Amino acid sequence: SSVLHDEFIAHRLGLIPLTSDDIVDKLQYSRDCTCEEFCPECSVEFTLDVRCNEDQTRHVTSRDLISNSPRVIPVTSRNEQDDILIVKLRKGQELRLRAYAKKGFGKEHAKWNPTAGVAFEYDPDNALRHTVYPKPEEWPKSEYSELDEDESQAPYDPNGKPERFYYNVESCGSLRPETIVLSALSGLKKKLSDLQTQLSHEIQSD
Amino acid sequence: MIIPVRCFTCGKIVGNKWEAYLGLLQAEYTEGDALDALGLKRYCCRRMLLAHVDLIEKLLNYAPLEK
Amino acid sequence: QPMIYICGECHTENEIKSRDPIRCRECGYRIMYKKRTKRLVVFDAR
Amino acid sequence: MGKRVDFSARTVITPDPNLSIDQVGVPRSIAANMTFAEIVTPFNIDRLQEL
Amino acid sequence: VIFNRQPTLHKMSMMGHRVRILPWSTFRLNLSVTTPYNADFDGDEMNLHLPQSLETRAEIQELAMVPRMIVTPQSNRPVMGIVQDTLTAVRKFTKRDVFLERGEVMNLLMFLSTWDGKVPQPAILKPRPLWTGKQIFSLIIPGHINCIRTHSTHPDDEDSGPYKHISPGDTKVVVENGELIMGILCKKSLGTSAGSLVHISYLEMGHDITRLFYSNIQTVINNWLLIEGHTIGIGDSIADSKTYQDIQNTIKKAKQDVIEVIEKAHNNELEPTPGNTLRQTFENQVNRILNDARDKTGSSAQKSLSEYNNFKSMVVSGAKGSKINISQVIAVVGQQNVEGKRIPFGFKHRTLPHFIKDDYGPESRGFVENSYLAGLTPTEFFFHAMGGREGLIDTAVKTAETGY
Amino acid sequence: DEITPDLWQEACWIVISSYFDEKGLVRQQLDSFDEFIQMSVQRIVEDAPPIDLQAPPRYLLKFEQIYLSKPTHWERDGAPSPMMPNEARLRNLTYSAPLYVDITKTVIKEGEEQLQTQHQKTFIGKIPIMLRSTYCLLNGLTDRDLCELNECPLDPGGYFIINGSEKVLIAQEKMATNTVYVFAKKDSKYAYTGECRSCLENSSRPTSTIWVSMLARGAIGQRIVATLPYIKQEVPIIIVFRALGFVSDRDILEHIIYDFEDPEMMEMVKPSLDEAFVIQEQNVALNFIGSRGAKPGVTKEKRIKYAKEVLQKEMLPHVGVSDFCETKKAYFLGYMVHRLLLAALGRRELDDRDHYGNKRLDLAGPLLAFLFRGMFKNLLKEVRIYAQKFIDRGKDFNLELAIKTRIISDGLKYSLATGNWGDQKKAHQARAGVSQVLNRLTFASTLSHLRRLNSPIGRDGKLAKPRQLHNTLWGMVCPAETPEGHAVGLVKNLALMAYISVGSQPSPILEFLEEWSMENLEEISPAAIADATKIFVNGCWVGIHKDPEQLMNTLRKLRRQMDIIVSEVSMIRDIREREIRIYTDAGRICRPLLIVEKQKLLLKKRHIDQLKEREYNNYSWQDLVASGVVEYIDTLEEETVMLAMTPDDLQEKEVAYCSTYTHCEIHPSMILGVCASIIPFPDHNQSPRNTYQSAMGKQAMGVYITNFHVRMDTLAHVLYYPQKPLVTTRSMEYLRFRELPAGINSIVAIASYTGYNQEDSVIMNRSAVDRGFFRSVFYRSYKEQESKKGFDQEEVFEKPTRETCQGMRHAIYDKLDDDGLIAPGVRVSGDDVIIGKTVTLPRYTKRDCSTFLRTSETGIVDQVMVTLNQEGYKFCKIRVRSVRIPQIGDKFASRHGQKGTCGIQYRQEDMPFTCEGITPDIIINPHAIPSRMTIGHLIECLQGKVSANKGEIGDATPFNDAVNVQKISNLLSDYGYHLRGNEVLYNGFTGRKITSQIFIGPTYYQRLKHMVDDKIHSRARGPIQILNRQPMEGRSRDGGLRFGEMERDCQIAHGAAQFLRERLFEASDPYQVHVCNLCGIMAIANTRTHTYECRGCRNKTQISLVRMPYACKLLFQELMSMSIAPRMMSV
Amino acid sequence: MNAPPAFESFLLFEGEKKITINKDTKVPNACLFTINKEDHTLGNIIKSQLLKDPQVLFAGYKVPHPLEHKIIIRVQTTPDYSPQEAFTNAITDLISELSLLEERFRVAIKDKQEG
RNA sequence: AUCGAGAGGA
Ligand SMILES: [Mg+2]
Ligand SMILES: [Zn+2]
Ligand SMILES: [Zn+2]
Ligand SMILES: [Zn+2]
Ligand SMILES: [Zn+2]
């Protein structure tokens, strides 16, 4: 009975981050699960049931998303930062729903993206000249720069290659940032391993 | 109508910051200092909080369909 | 079978059969709304 | 002199650097609506039966 | 299929295309084939007609296919050429100081359909292997065509003095045996004019080879522009303090000149020229002064531009814009005209209630002495809106008469 | 005391805010309607003549008073209840109030047997009510009260609800009346023509135009003629003067030439005298007028009577229509001749047709008054016939049954419902385009539609002069907002502080002029008019004066003190020609301005102080006007005003420009309208770009109104996450764009990235779109009603069945309920059924007439409403909800004319990123900037970067010297960014830096109504039209695309004859006919029995089959209908 | 209406091969690897690792259409070597590099949390 | 469904 239609609430629930640290590796994709639509091996059940009976506006927040799995809960609800606001309700308005959370990654939808920004940089002093500043004096210095203030950019390195890449991986909350990096390395390595397996089948089949 | 959950650009959660942002503004913070207190350092998330219009508060001035 | 409607003004749940003038029994208001179905509609939160 | 015709479609145009100059990128719904009457022969009997 | 856009003005507004089924719900077009249709992607819609017989299909395939439509009989030149990003980028790519590394070169060669698989010997072997942009466009260029053109910035006094065949500015395009021996490619070399590379490709090589030439230029150049990048911002609209002072001095001198002409006319010290009344002669003198001011300020802005300026990049390549646009963005917007004359006295002997009566000065009658970056004053804003309304009316009223 | 420059930008905007707290944006509509109801209806009722009817007994039936109650609604039981506008919208009612008139019928037969019977409150009609007017139930309600009634507090009102449809009256331009305008047509028999559209103060007849022309040179000299109304032949002016009682030539030239020392005027009038010497007395001149007329009476007596009546009623009604006014009419016609001679002698300029001082805006009030005059006249006529047919029998009659109230009610309702402005019978003489459906797509579109003006020159006209932006539109009409299609310059929009005058009576002004030293026109001698100054009031020359300067000082003092002269009265002193023209009539567009003392504003700092505490001490705009600090100046009085653009102009300068200013702009940005006031930095764009944005702000998605949950609109788009712009102008505070914005601040990068944004296209971030970026919801309402019109056939909502219904499609009806209506929350795909309606037959005894979804929509039912319509059968509205996620082909626009469709969407890892991992929401092509010169886009992007990094809202008000690009760049360099808004970006695919540093930052983008899914269409052998068996027209009809004449010509040039035949014969309307080989006329074929015969030739063997288009067969048959014999000869 | 499901970028259709090897006939000892349901993420690393092999004469990749979800990697090697062998070794080297990077990131995290 | 009108798009 809230003022936001159903797809608004659904979209809004999809974007709430859920703690995924140790559970995401264990759960299966519903593609791979041998069950029906759902099961505890490939999904997590959430329930939300709020009714504004009192005169002040009721803030239906992520704290009202009750899970069957204690490990997978809304990040803000984890034991400061306030809870994500799902909808504001007026006296007499009511929201009752039943969600299921799945395993996915950011290629399918940004809600499965664990990062709240990935700062990536290399060659802070423009030594490789991969950028060409028309007026190098006008540009601020990188936080990773090692140059005296009179010097705007490093002397050009003809024999140089990009090395020393700087990262700042900010987490949306679902995974720890170091878990994001470790899971990224493992996922890239398994992509390459699967590619090599299929490569071997194609080579031997010829 | 309501504060978005994530920042459209980076995907940082801003849904839990609207109420805190308003509370800081009535605490006589400037909008910039308030956005700094909430940890919105990229101008995309500052855009999200600073340009938000809480229309849901006006939609809650109408009685619902059922009592 | 009942087709209970809600009043646009008094928000009263009242049953009205076919071939009946559309009138709320509590306040006589002439605009009524159907209630949300019981069927199961699914949303991908995307 | 001018008239309405069948087997026509219309939609917004969009850039595509990855088409050749003589190509047009068509939606699958326009192409699923529009049809071409292909004559059956022993050369195409199997393919047309598949379709 | 026949692909059509309205208004169907000439035979190139309905051309044959081969269908490529793709995910979303729009008609996806190549970017060279947009100029024949007069089509841009600001909500334009186009009509697809599917021939329903082998005879009509053969007809369209042998008569109306786009490669057969590259050269128009209207003006014996190409009707489609290289266009915005590909033209700015090919201009930047064929500059003399574009050096590609081995991995970049292989990346670009992945996007050549007509590539024999042989990596060319780099133009620079030591201290580090480097290919040039001309060396890769030579691979894009088909057959063994031969072509001489001149880049738009080619100085006119260079073909006389020395260095005629070794151009300091890398102008004077020369393609020999299908290799870009020298020169910066631009609108003059890849556009829709007569004798360009696309025209000579169509005349010497067939329409199929020319189709592949268009496609290969676009793919290779767009994938290189992913490295180079092209942009535009406030920094391209800005000029140095010296340029601003020169422009303001020019405008001040021009306004004093107009004041002098006004004082002469007021004192009857102005005599009419043959073929005009005194009012028309005064108007001619004032308009000449202000046009001279606009041109001088525009030249000042143009010379102030650096080689990194993106306005200058797009104007030089011919992709978009003109030197007058740069002058209006940097130097001065200039005189606003209604029906070919200065702003009329719509009030009683006034253009606006903010002026005195009988004020034939430049600002009173609609001279915008500001640039678009500087911003127009309210009266300049209204006069500019009047001048722009004239263009909107012309565009909306000429169509019926021209179509009839 | 004085407001210093450092405070000025606050003071002026404080003043502006006070204006919008007092007036609003739709004040002209409300004031027009209020004047129409308070005054115009009563004047129209009283100005009608009493209808005296007698066989004997007689009855007069005088109407004396009107009463307009509040809007009410009568049910079938007849109980009157107060009807709320939302109930009218939902139930398809008409938000109208009943008009009752007091009638007085006195019986007079003989012998002083008189007795009066008064019928108090006789229900004379129903008048639709403009919302938020004084007579609206939403009048004076608080925002809480409006929300209690399911109304938006931000809704401006200013429109009517007719049959549930919100209709807005467009102000109509017209040439002002009672004013002499001397023009010169290049191609005509006349050299100069002085016209005067004359109309009496309280309108009762159309405008009677009188022309006074001069015949073009080539008998001896130039002759002056006068084209009087109701006379089809030119008449010499001297004849007209003699017909008015001025026979002596001296008297006529006393009335025409006021300075006898001027022989030029004399010799130029002499030909007219020489042409009229045989006629020398009043009766003969009247006979001449009657003879030249189109009804020449055989007897001179009735000729003279007709000429008398014409010269007393139709000639110059504004001068006076009573008798003994011939002196005033003679003076005025002499003034017309004087003006014509001044134009012909070059002493006066020809009048400009385009000058808005010469124009009037016909608003809702004066337009409804035109309707009401016509309709009340028709009603009184019908009453006359009804009462006559009864008194002819010599018996009393009931006026309640004589008054058929449907005339006024149905007339006003029809005219506002259709827009055809006039009687329903004269549906072709009526002028359409008035009263359009209110645009509810976004709040800006609604405001602009409510502030819309119309120049009825005709779109077909290709003369650019009326389309040109005249100089006099300054401050009155937006220079930018205008449609760019076929109505460039004709459809206009009010500037923000523009106020259309509502009208006023000249009686107090005339009375004061009498008490003052003015001399009436009948009391003077003409010899005094030479040096004296004429005084016109609403076009009527009322007298003369001796010191016009101190008269103007007195009148300006009176108007600035809110004395007898009201604020909207215009008072123009033309000095070179000694007229003083005072105007009180309606339709005069004017604007407020700050009065200026010697060289100082009268707006001191105390006024700003009292305006700052506007909410405590109730010091409002009206107190500012009453203080003599602000003045409304109309277009015609601006000609006599010397404006200061800013108080900086009032400073003493090294060379003084004026030093004698009289007024000052409150702020120059008020020259813009509603949609142009949203453009940031519009003075840094090319003006066509500002016009295109002013058009495209109206298709932008947002929240068109707060109470959208209860409205059953046919089409509605609501944006999920509207944002206020980071870079805004100070005018949007009054447009309420901050409370109902129509866009999102997007991190836009102007770059060439992959080539998918070329030629006016954009690359959007798929990840941002996944997060709700520019997502919208599309609400579509379907209406249906079950009609019990008669026992022959009745419709009914009920779940159809396969065994009883006949025209039942194969689509499943399971989603419907037993009531026949789908339930909310049910997901419905294309071609699905939402209402099951069945109609009883004369597959038996009932046929299926169900309502399907508009094909290819795929929404969810948002809600279902059931009620009863006006007549009272069951009536259903179903709102279906479809979430529109932006995709390739959807149109987006910035506020600078920069429109484009989404070329492609890349995920966040595929988009280019800054060192701090910010990816652009949108990437637009740099080639869209240079030709367009939308530098406001770049300045807005840079200002928005500063605003987002600083935590403020950028000030992009047009003309602001405290904000330039260098300041913004210096501010941006303080937040660790390149001062010009560039950043090093990295390629998302490879991670390498892009060599060219990209220009990136927040810019306010808009999602426009034009989504590709509402435009994509295809056909392959669908339905065909009935008349010509060709494909239908439209997506909705599953129609085919038109292969037009130009396509035929293109394919002829191609030489593609078989493709041309396929398109124009085989893919459109293939057909076969049988032709007689002898007469070539279509024969009769019977293919079942194989008997072919031509009845004409009486043969049945020489028939031939011909394959021709059906349209060609239809053409040949329509030619045979015309007795033409198109014989298709096959040999 | 025409929106492909988002999983079609990652998931293989039934009967569709993850990788297909086609001999390039223009030059000797060259192959085209058409890899389905991958994008620049694997293409760029495989190409750049192949460029580190001195026996690789050409190594390039392209996404022929962004709306389509395949990549093509062209590899040419010296005659004594093979493009299939080069591609295999490139994947092996990338896997070993990522394993080492993962172990070293684990060690760095342990050091950072401990001290 | 037709017709007309209006509003829009390129
Ligand atoms: Mg277009
Ligand atoms: Zn499962
Ligand atoms: Zn962010
Ligand atoms: Zn009720
Ligand atoms: Zn015959």
Residue F601 forms beta bridges with which residues? F596
Answer yes or no: are the C-beta atoms of F54 and F677 closer than 8 Å: no
F810: exposed, middle or buried (Cβ count in 10 Å: 0-12, 13-18, 19+): exposed
Q: Beta C13-15 vs F171-175: how paired, if at all?
A: unpaired
* Cα(F123)–Cα(F297) distance, integer angstroms: 45
Residue D6 to residue F1022, Cβ atoms within 8 A: yes
Structure-token pair, residue F355: 């000058």
| Cα–Cα distance measured from residue F183 to residue F351, given in angstroms and rounded to the nearest whole number | 6
Give the pair of three-digit tokens for residue E146.
């031969």
Rounded Cα gap, residues G55 and G36, in angstroms = 26
Beta bridge partners of F839: F795, F847
Q: Which residues contact F36 (CB under 8 A, 6 or more apart)?
A: F364, F365, F366, F368, F369, F372
Task: Please provide residue G32's backbone torsions phi and psi, each rounded to the nearest 5 degrees.
Answer: -115, 120
Chain A within 8 Å of G7 (Cβ-Cβ)? Answer: yes
Mutation pick from E2, E14, E29 vs chain D, by most beta carbons of D within 10 Å, is: E29
**Structural contact between residues E197 and E175, judged by C-beta atoms closer than 8 angstroms:** yes
Q: Which residues surround ligand 4, an ion (CB under 5 A)?
A: C 7, 10, 12, 24, 26-27, 29
Q: Which nucleotides of H are covered by protein (CB under 7 A)?
A: 1-10
Mutate to test the interface with B, among A9, A55, A88 (most CBs of B within 10 A): A88
Please, what is the angle between helix F935-950 and helix F965-973, to 10°? Answer: 40
Same domain? A68 vs A24:
yes
- Cβ contact F644:F661 at 8 Å: yes
- CA Rg, chain G, in Å? 18
Rounded to whole angstroms, the Cα distance separating E80 from E71 reads: 8
- D-contacting residues of E 211-230, CB under 8 Å? 211-212, 214-215, 218-219, 222
Burial category of E157 from C-beta neighbours within 10 Å (exposed 0-12, middle 13-18, buried 19 and up): exposed
User: Which of A110, A134, A167 is the endpoint of a domain?
Assistant: A110
What gap in Å lies between CA F313 and CA F204, rounded to an integer? Answer: 12
Give whole-number Cα distances, F452 to B42, E328, F169, F445, F447, in Å.
42, 33, 9, 10, 9
Measure F454 CA to H6 C1' (Å): 13
Write down how long chain F is: 1131
CA-nearest residue to G104 within chain A is A182
Q: How far is the CA of B40 from the centre of ligand 3 (A)?
A: 8
SS3 F172: strand
Nearest CA in chain E to A158: E128
Q: In whole angstroms, give the CA distance from residue E21 to residue D51.
A: 17
Which residue type does F489 have? G
Residue E313 DSSP SS3: helix
Whether chain F has a CB inside 8 Å of the CB on A121: the answer is: yes
- Asked if residue B1 lies in contact with residue B55, where contact means CB atoms within 8 angstroms, the answer is yes
Closest C-alpha among F470, F542, F540 to residue F317: F540
Structure token digits, residue F922: 């949108």
- Rounded Cα distance between G114 and A29, Å, is 35
Strand partners for F864: F878
CA F46 to each of CA F65, F400, F584: distance values in angstroms, whole numbers, following the listed order: 8, 19, 21
C-alpha distances out from residue D10 to E4, E6, F48, Å: 9, 11, 59
Are the C-beta atoms of A199 and G91 separated by less than 8 Å? yes
In angstroms, how far is H2 C1' from F1024 CA? 14
Cis peptide before F456 (omega within 30 of 0): no
Straight-line distance from the first to the last Cα atom of chain D, in angstroms, rounded to the nearest whole number: 37
Contacts of F125 (CB under 8 A, 6+ apart): F98, F99, F375, F379, F405, F407, F408, F409, F412
Q: Report the length, in residues, of chain G.
A: 115
Residue holding tokens 């450092």? Answer: F6
Range of the domain at A129: 111-206
Token digits for F399?
């006026």
| Of residues F19, F892, F826, the one with CA closest to residue F499 | F19
Query: For residue F927, what are the CA distances in angstroms to E38, E222, F751, F760, F934?
Result: 16, 14, 9, 8, 11
Residues on chain D touching G1 (C-beta within 8 angstroms): 29
Report the chain F residue with the minimal C-alpha distance to residue A16. F771
User: Chains B vs A: touching, with 3+ CB pairs under 8 Å?
Assistant: yes
What is the DSSP code string of chain A?
A: --SS-HHHHHHHHHTS-B--TTTTTTS--TTT--SSS--TTT-EEEEEEEE--SSSPEEEEGGG-EES-SSS-BTTT-----PPEEEEE-TT-EEEEEEEE----TTT-GGG--EEEEEEEE-SS-SS-SS--SSGGGSPPPTT----TT--SPPP-TT-----EEEEEEE-SSS-HHHHHHHHHHHHHHHHHHHHHHHHHHHHH-
Domain that holds residue E92: 84-228
**Could you tell me the CA-to-CA distances from F55 to F52, F61, F392, F394, F638 in Å, in that order?**
10, 15, 6, 7, 60
Give the minimum alpha-carbon distance from A205 to chain F in angstroms, rounded to a whole number: 32
Q: Which domain holds residue G68?
A: 1-115
Q: Specify whether the CB–CB gap between F777 and F718 falls below 8 A.
A: yes
3-class DSSP state of F343: helix
CA of F166 to C1' of H5 (A): 16
| Whether residues A126 and A137 fall in one domain | yes
Distance F1054 CA to ligand 3 centre (A): 55
Query: Helix axis angle, G40-51 relative to E102-109, nearest 10°?
Result: 130
In sequence order, what DSSP letters do the residues of E337-366 get, joined into one string? -BTTBSPP--SSS-SSTTS-SS--STTTTT
Structurally, how many domains does chain G consist of? Answer: 1
> Is chain B adjacent to chain D, meaning 3+ CB pairs within 8 angstroms?
no
Is E157 annotated for ligand binding?
no
What is the F17 CA–ligand 2 centroid distance (Å)?
61
Q: Closest Cα to residue G8, out of F249, D28, F327, B53?
A: D28
User: What does residue F282 show for φ and ψ, rounded to 5 degrees?
Assistant: -65, -45
In E, which residues are within 8 Å of A134 by CB distance?
A: 235, 306, 308
Beta bridge partners of F644: F664
Among all residues of F, which ones are annotated catalytic?
760
Contacting residues of F for G69, CB less than 8 Å apart: none
Amino acid at E30: N
E141/E220 Cα distance (integer angstroms) = 12
Which value, in Å, is the radius of gyration of the alpha carbons in chain F? 36
Segment F385-393 long-range contacts (CB within 8 Å, at least 24 positions apart): F387/F51, F387/F53, F387/F59, F387/F61, F388/F53, F391/F53, F391/F54, F391/F55, F391/F57, F391/F59, F392/F55
Q: Which ligand is nearest to the CA of C25?
A: 4
State how far the Cα of G17 lies from the Cα of E335, in Å rounded to an integer.
66
Q: Is F902 annotated as a binding residue?
A: no
The count of C-alpha atoms lying within 13 angstroms of the C-alpha of F30, restricted to the half-sphere facing its C-beta, is: 17
Alpha-carbon span E52 to F1066, nearest angstrom: 9
Ligand at minimal distance from the CA of F767 is 3
Q: Which residues of D are known binding-site members for DNA?
A: 4
> What span, in angstroms and rounded, lies between the C-alpha atoms of F397 and F119?
13
Tell me how far the alpha carbon of residue F441 lies from the centroid of ligand 1, in angstroms.
23
State which residues form the domain around F341: 181-361
> Amino acid identity, residue B16?
N
Examine the domain organization and report whether A62 and A162 are in the same domain.
Answer: no
What tokens were used for G41? Answer: 């993420």
Cis peptide before D27 (omega within 30 of 0): no
| Nucleotide nearest the Cα atom of F420 (by C1') | H5
Of F121, F122, F118, nearest to F104 by C-alpha is F118
Angstrom distance (rounded) from CA F193 to CA C18: 72
CA angle G62, F921, F678 (to 5 degrees): 145
CA F457 from chain center: how many Å? 13
| E strand or H helix that includes residue G94 | helix G83-114
Amino acid at E242: K
**Chain position carrying tokens 């640039």:** E371
Measured over all CA atoms, what is the biggest interatomic distance in chain G, rounded to whole angstroms? 58
A166 CA to chain G: closest CA distance, Å? 14
**How far is residue E36's CA from residue E30's CA, in Å, rounded to a whole number?**
11
- Whose atoms come closest to the Cα of A33: which ligand? 2
Distance C3 CA to H7 C1' (A): 39
DSSP state of F431: B
Nucleotide closest to residue F448 (CA–C1'): H7
Burial F362-374 (b: 16+ CB within 10 A, else e): bbbbbbbbbbbbb
Cβ-based neighbours of G100, under 8 Å, separated by 6 or more: none
Q: What is the DSSP letter of D24?
A: E
From CA F638, how far away is CA F619, in angstroms rounded?
A: 28
Q: CA gyration radius for chain A?
A: 24
Interface test with E, best of G22, G46, G74, G77 (most E CBs within 10 A): G74
3-state secondary structure of F880: strand
For residues A86 and A103, membership in a common domain is answered with yes
Long-range CB contacts for residues G16-23, cutoff 8 Å, separation at least 24: G17/A198, G17/A202, G18/A194, G18/A195, G18/A198, G19/A195, G19/A198, G19/A199, G19/A202, G20/A202, G21/A202, G21/A203, G21/A206, G21/G84
Q: Provide the 8-state DSSP code for G56.
A: E
Among the three residues A65, A89, A110, which one is the final residue of a domain in this structure?
A110
Let me know: does E228 contact E89? Beta carbons within 8 Å. Answer: yes
Q: Give the whole-angstrom CA distance, residue F473 versus residue F634.
A: 11
Q: What residues of chain C, 24 to 43, have a C-beta less than 8 Å from chain B?
A: 33
Q: Which chains touch A (3 or more CB pairs under 8 A)?
A: B, C, E, F, G
**Inter-chain contact F918–B43, Cβ cutoff 8 Å?**
yes
- Please state, in angstroms and as integers, the Cα–Cα distance from residue C9 to each residue in B58, C31, C33, following that order: 20, 8, 10
Distance CA A16, CA A72 (A): 12
Domain boundaries of chain C, sorted by first residue = 1-46
Give the residue carrying structure tokens 């004040």.
F27
CA of F981 to C1' of H7 (A): 40
Separation of CA F1091 and ligand 5 centre (Å): 14
Closest CA to F176 of F358, F364, F369: F358
C-alpha E148/C-alpha E224 separation (Å) is: 25
Of residues E88, E220, E215, E199, the one with CA closest to residue E152: E88
Which chain F residues are Cβ-neighbours of E375 within 8 angstroms?
A: 681, 683-684, 958-959, 964
Among residues F17, F2, F4, F7, the alpha carbon closest in space to that of F624 is found at F17
